[PDB]
Amino acid sequence: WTVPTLNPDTPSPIFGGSTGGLLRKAQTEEFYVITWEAKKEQIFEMPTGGAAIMRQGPNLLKFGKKEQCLALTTQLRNKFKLTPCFYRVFPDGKVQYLHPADGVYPEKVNAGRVGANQNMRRIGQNVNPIKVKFSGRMMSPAEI
Amino acid sequence: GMLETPVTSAPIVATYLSNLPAYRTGVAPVLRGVEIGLAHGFLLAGPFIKLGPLRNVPETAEIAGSLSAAGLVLILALCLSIYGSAQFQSARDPLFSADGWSEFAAGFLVGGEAGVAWAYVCTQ
Amino acid sequence: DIAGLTPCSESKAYAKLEKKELKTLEKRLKQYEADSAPAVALKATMERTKARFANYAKAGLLCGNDGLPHLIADPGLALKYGHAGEVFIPTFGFLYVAGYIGYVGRQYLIAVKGEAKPTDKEIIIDVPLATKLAWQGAGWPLAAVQELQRGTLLEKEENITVSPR
Amino acid sequence: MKDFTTYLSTAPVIATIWFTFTAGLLIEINRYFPDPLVFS
Amino acid sequence: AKKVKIAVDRNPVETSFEKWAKPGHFSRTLSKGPNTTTWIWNLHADAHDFDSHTSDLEEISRKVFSAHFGQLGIIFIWLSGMYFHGARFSNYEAWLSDPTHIKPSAQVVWPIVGQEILNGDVGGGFQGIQITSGFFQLWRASGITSELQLYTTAIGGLVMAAAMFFAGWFHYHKAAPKLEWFQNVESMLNHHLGGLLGLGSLAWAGHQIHVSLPVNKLLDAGVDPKEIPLPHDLLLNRAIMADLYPSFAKGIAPFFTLNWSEYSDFLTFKGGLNPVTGGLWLSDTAHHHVAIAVLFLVAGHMYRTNWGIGHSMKEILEAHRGPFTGEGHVGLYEILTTSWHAQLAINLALFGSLSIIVAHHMYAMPPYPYLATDYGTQLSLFTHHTWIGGFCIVGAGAHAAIFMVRDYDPTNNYNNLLDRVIRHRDAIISHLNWVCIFLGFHSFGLYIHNDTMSALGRPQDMFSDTAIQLQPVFAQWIQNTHFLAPQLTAPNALAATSLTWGGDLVAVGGKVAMMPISLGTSDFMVHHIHAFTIHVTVLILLKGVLFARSSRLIPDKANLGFRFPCDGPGRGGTCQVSAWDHVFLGLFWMYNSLSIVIFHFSWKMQSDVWGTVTASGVSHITGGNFAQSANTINGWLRDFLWAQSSQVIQSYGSALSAYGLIFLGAHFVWAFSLMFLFSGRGYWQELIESIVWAHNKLKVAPAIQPRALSITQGRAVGVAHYLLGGIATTWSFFLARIISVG
Amino acid sequence: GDFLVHHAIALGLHTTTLILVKGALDARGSKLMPDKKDFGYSFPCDGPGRGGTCDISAYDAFYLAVFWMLNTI
Amino acid sequence: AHIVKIYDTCIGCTQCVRACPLDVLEMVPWDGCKASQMASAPRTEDCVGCKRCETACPTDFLSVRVYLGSESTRSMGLSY
Ligand code: CLA
Ligand code: CLA
Ligand code: CLA
Ligand code: CLA
Ligand code: CLA
Ligand SMILES: CC1=C(C/C=C(\C)CCC[C@H](C)CCC[C@H](C)CCCC(C)C)C(=O)c2ccccc2C1=O
């Protein structure tokens, strides 16, 4: 598995449009692009409101925040049994790929992943807040 | 994309906006400030004169109302100035810059007060 | 008398209060017939009003300057001057009933904890058991004390869940 | 009939009968002993 | 071409008490029994949520149909009780003789714990609670003259109640209609238009023509009620009817020969109010129901069922297709024949709006004899039917959002009217948001302007009739147009429909029944308060429906459901995002808006309409202080709430003392509700932990684990107590006031 | 008349103390949130899980107690 | 950015990962439980603080904990 490269010329579903789409943020900070393959033309529900028809073959959509992309991904996987993937696109033209980070959806365990933010203790074994006081910033006992 | 609509996308509407001082590019920000300030300043005198606390006084009503319209233009000019200070601290149009907006605010004050004074002269 | 109060039987304001209430009833009476249904009802009310004011005076209550009965709560003052029936005696009257209700409910709750499905015995009451426990509760003060002395009234501190501290 | 008597044993039905009985007893006592304020 | 036919299933369900002894049987989740107290609340909350018990539409429809028979059976018991209590515990017979001096009463209390003082002196040698339901006026209009007639109706009411409960059992356990039966919308409309409304109107016209009109004609003439002919004597003896109405001498030949003008003596078009009784002419009311009967019977032959002729409702919807709306009304027919919630959303909306229209028309055109001069009945009926309409409309929003979450399917809705509305919801809510802000400033800000100018000693600067004026010129023009209608635009009408438009007052028994209502600056200001508070209620409810499925905050709100508390403290906090919470908030604003409506009505009537007629003129209850005082918030506080609450707070020791008690008790329930609204279950679950510890210490801890109410139930308990306390407070204040002075 | 009012004042003092005292003794944790100390004195909630935890912090106990203080005074 | 911590009582049910509406969590190999897998939080910069993961954790007390911290455009869930 290798990191996919986004194709900006991918066709988009048949959608009239709505007022729930991108705002000025997309032009200044970032936006998100989700792409997938469709076996047949079908009607799905846009997370921004309304219904759109997915073309047979590749499809591409642009959303304002990550949660909107992953909300559509859940719908496509659960009902239509598709395998979408989405990116983060910056105004400068850079494209960042994510979900699936390594090509396998996170629900399935995969070798090569490195545990992060894992504490080898229980919640009840954290230190008291007094012992992490005056540490330069508000710090919870869980952080240390 | 965005929901197309005649109000959002129509030829007649677009041409009208493109001729307004705010959208008429190629004009110095100061001159646009004067043109905008004059229009608002002239109108601003109306409500103060007719519905102010001294509206029923024969001759003082005109003076008091216009003098209050001049005051509001001064407050608005301050709002324009500080807005430029906060917004532009670091693009195509010169107006949306620290240098451009400061000239724009100055023109609004000059135009606005001129409009208020011009409105008074119309009455007397 | 006590705390500056006076017996209601000797209170001028108390007597005047009775006349006011009877006068109000009499005023409504004279707009009806002698033995019509409304007239009979009003006369019945007046009889109860006269009986009520005689009973409170006969009970030896104390009336204030307002001319209304006041109750004595201190056990020493109550037993000293024969006001035990106002608060003192009713105090032990209520506690017997309150302990009766609470003790009966506790007995039933313990009884069903031994059953296979205690939760279904709480929404759907076991009426035969409840009636059995209802009658045996008359001796709750005796049974309650004996549990206390035998040490089976309270749970052990080690068998009760508590939050981290 | 077993199920019907089980329905009457449900909490809402028992409470209605119990409070109907309890209220009736208190109402009847005050009907024959009106205006009780002191044990006497 | 599926034929319209009767279709049922035999013995679908067995009649047994087995499931009566197994609470929660209807739901898979609750069938296992309780482990925590939360189970108990869940049992009652989901009892009537049929759509969630089963996914079968046929099973859902059958439960709805029989649950409706139970509702009908309950109304008949209630109606039977009202007729029975009129026969046995009322002064109706005495009231017929002296309607203007005797107060209606149909409830008597037992002499226990000293409550017999509530049996007030109402007249006719009778003691009882004065009623404001208007049943005496209704019975007189229909021609009831004895308690025997009231008694027979009550017995008939119980027989109908028994029939309704049998029908519900029969059509669920014995012969349950199939799903295809329920989906004959064309057939149902035909029967309900021509059969329910149409024949119902014609049948009632028969009663009025043959019973109400003769009886009320003699009652108004002064004949003693006991000496009036019985209704069957009027029916059997055409000679008697001819004396009262000569048209009866010609029989029914004029009807079939089209000489309908022969019936002009009892089918009139007078308009106005009957001077003797102050209510609408019954001859006018009979011609109304005869005209309405024909209109609905014609209306019931519009839809096609089995014989070709008629309209297909699907075809009508699909033909109405324009350039601005894409596909159009396509797909609505399938929505409205497969979603009960969608049907309920429409019907609640219009049924509630109808109840509000009833309130306005009944006060302005009093339809019963002696209804107008009974100010307690006028105030109660207007206020009752406004509250009923308010709750129904809020329900319409609730069940529109339920449809949006559960029954909405994007595949069936693509580019149709419904889809396009969802695709510019931000445009709709943003514009409606601005309108509410605009209306709040320019209506309530005027009151704040007046209050400040008045406190500063600048009355000449206020918005009022003696100062800067705001005249409802448009409303005043309409009042004048309707006043002159009989001259040119309604030539065959003798009088204007109402005396509110203009003219002369009608006085019955020395009291004003109705007189022209003048609209001034205060009326201009209060009306734009109504528009403000109504528009805000639309904003809250419409926002909930349009954003039920998703928003820019929760992109997948549909999966969370219709009734959930939040999506957690993330994204800054998402408390109360569900569409259920938009009904919860909408209830407060509906209560706020209708409270001003019934305060506006109460003060305007007492100030400008109601009063006592004397030689000099009309003296009103509050003496015409609405015009000068209702333009400031201080005026409402002092002149309306503080002054008129004198009656309720002085009620102790009289027959109205009950209203005083409920006035305090209502204040209590309202304040009690703020405990649930201002707090959260996190505090209460920890409090119960310490309380449970004490019970554990004494071996008296319950087997069903105590739990603090859920988040949603806290909001539901809060709003229910808030509404009950607030509404009951006004209820006590209105009745103790109007009964005392009115 | 003074008897009834004084006992209402006692209700105010005891209930206000109850709310404040619970907010302090449960500040460090509880069965519904054993590790409340790790979140601080003032936080919104722990989410809708475990039945719902609105107004569970010690800050919220003080917030509810201010109402009872105003009522008592 | 919020703080998300996984504690050693995890049983590797994967319910937290499925629940997360922003793909913040993932499963990694482990030897401390029967399932031989543990939850991980490699992408906490995308966490919004909904606490759907905590709602889904079966262990008592929770094995995944979210401590709301500094706010940002991503953690505040803004599309503008
Ligand atoms: C709730 C607390 C309380 C309070 C404030 C009072 C107050 C009073 N009691 Mg009462 N009393 C109470 C509870 C209380 N009592 C209880 C629970 C009982 C047992 C059921 C009694 C039994 C009782 C008796 C038998 C007598 C009083 C008497 C008195 C008065 C003076 C002595 C006294 O008690 O001083 C302050 C109170 C206390 C410090 C609390 C304990 C009081 C004990 C139980 C009684 C003391 C009696 C005293 C030795 C009598 C000496 C003669 C006296 C004339 C000076 C006073 C009005 C006396 C009286 O009638 O005086 C006119 C009296 O003879 N009380
Ligand atoms: C004695 C006759 C009888 C019997 C034995 C049954 C038995 C059954 N019915 Mg049937 N049913 C009957 C009569 C009967 N029904 C009638 C008369 C109707 C017409 C309304 C229906 C309509 C009906 C429906 C629509 C359904 C059933 C269902 C059921 C099953 C469960 C019912 C249940 O749990 O009820 C227990 C419920 C109660 C005791 C609540 C009684 C509610 C009534 C309407 C009284 C309402 C009073 C009202 C709230 C008063 C105001 C309250 C306020 C003062 C507080 C069971 C097979 C259900 C089923 O089969 O599900 C699979 C079902 O969905 N029945
Ligand atoms: C639904 C409403 C309704 C009803 C039921 C009636 C009924 C009646 N009207 Mg009225 N009427 C109405 C509306 C109504 N009207 C309206 C809207 C108007 C205004 C246009 C009038 C204007 C009007 C006038 C002007 C007159 C009546 C009259 C009558 C009576 C005689 C009609 C007649 O000659 O029938 C003729 C025949 C029939 C209707 C057919 C009867 C069929 C029977 C019932 C069949 C029974 C068959 C059965 C098997 C036998 C029994 C067997 C068993 C014992 C074993 C009758 C009581 C007349 C009267 O007498 O007034 C006092 C009269 O003069 N009406
Ligand atoms: C024709 C009228 C109608 C009908 C048939 C329904 C039917 C339904 N509604 Mg809807 N609804 C209506 C009107 C109607 N609604 C109106 C007018 C409103 C606005 C207030 C709503 C608001 C509403 C909401 C917000 C919800 C529903 C829901 C439901 C469903 C479940 C209801 C349930 O289980 O209740 C069970 C019944 C109870 C628990 C009893 C409630 C008791 C109230 C609160 C008592 C109030 C005080 C009382 C009347 C007077 C004083 C009492 C005294 C003892 C002190 C069901 C399909 C629920 C659902 O899930 O739908 C899918 C839901 O969430 N409705
Ligand atoms: C008296 C209490 C009160 C007040 C004043 C408001 C005010 C408002 N609510 Mg709120 N609300 C309240 C109680 C109140 N609410 C309650 C108890 C609840 C819980 C049920 C809600 C629930 C609620 C919801 C759910 C909604 C509102 C909405 C609104 C807005 C309506 C439209 C608008 O902008 O009007 C104009 C504003 C006013 C009339 C406020 C007073 C303005 C004064 C009189 C004039 C301005 C002052 C002036 C500039 C001088 C300032 C000087 C100073 C700076 C020195 C408004 C901000 C709706 C909204 O946001 O619509 C857009 C909305 O959706 N409210
Ligand atoms: C007071 C309060 C509680 C506590 C209230 C509870 C637990 C409800 C209490 C209901 C009754 C009083 C308890 C159950 C009674 C039994 C049915 C037994 C009664 C037996 C006889 C006496 C009838 C919450 O749970 C809550 C939740 C969310 C927001 C606000 C609040 C809130 O304000």
Residue numbers in the entry:
A (entry chain D): 53 to 196
B (entry chain L): 53 to 142, 157 to 190
C (entry chain F): 63 to 227
D (entry chain J): 1 to 40
E (entry chain A): 10 to 751
F (entry chain B): 516 to 588
G (entry chain C): 2 to 81
Please give sentences taken from the publication describing this entry.
Photosystem I (PSI) enables photo-electron transfer and regulates photosynthesis in the bioenergetic membranes of cyanobacteria and chloroplasts. Being a multi-subunit complex, its macromolecular organization affects the dynamics of photosynthetic membranes. A chloroplast photosystem I (PSI) of green algae consists of a core complex and three antenna modules: inner belt, outer belt and Lhca2-Lhca9 heterodimer, which together comprise 24 subunits.
We used 2D classification to separate PSI dimers from monomers in a reference-free manner, followed by 3D classification leading to a subset of 14,173 particles, which were refined to an overall resolution of 2.97 Å by applying C2 symmetry. Upon symmetry expansion, the resolution was further improved to 2.74 Å. To derive a structure of the chloroplast PSI dimer, we first built an accurate model of one monomer using the 2.74 Å resolution map and then fitted it into the cryo-EM density of the C2 refined dimer. Compared with the monomer, all but two core subunits (PsaH and PsaO) and one light-harvesting protein (Lhca2) are found in the dimer. In addition, two unaccounted densities corresponding to two loops on the stromal side of Lhca9 and PsaG could be interpreted in the dimer, due to the stabilization by the adjacent monomer. The first better-defined density is the Lhca9 loop region 132–153, which is stabilized owing to a direct interaction with PsaL of the second monomer within the dimer. As a result, the area is closely packed with PsaG, and therefore also the PsaG loop region 63–77 is better resolved in the dimer. Finally, co-factors of Lhca9 could be modelled at the interface between the monomers. The newly modelled β-carotene 622 is in Lhca9 and could be identified owing to structural stabilization of the interface region in the dimer. Instead, PsaH, which normally preserves a monomer, is not present, and Lhca9 with its associated co-factors acts as a symmetrical linker between the monomers, highlighting the importance of the light-harvesting antenna proteins for regulation of the macro-organization.
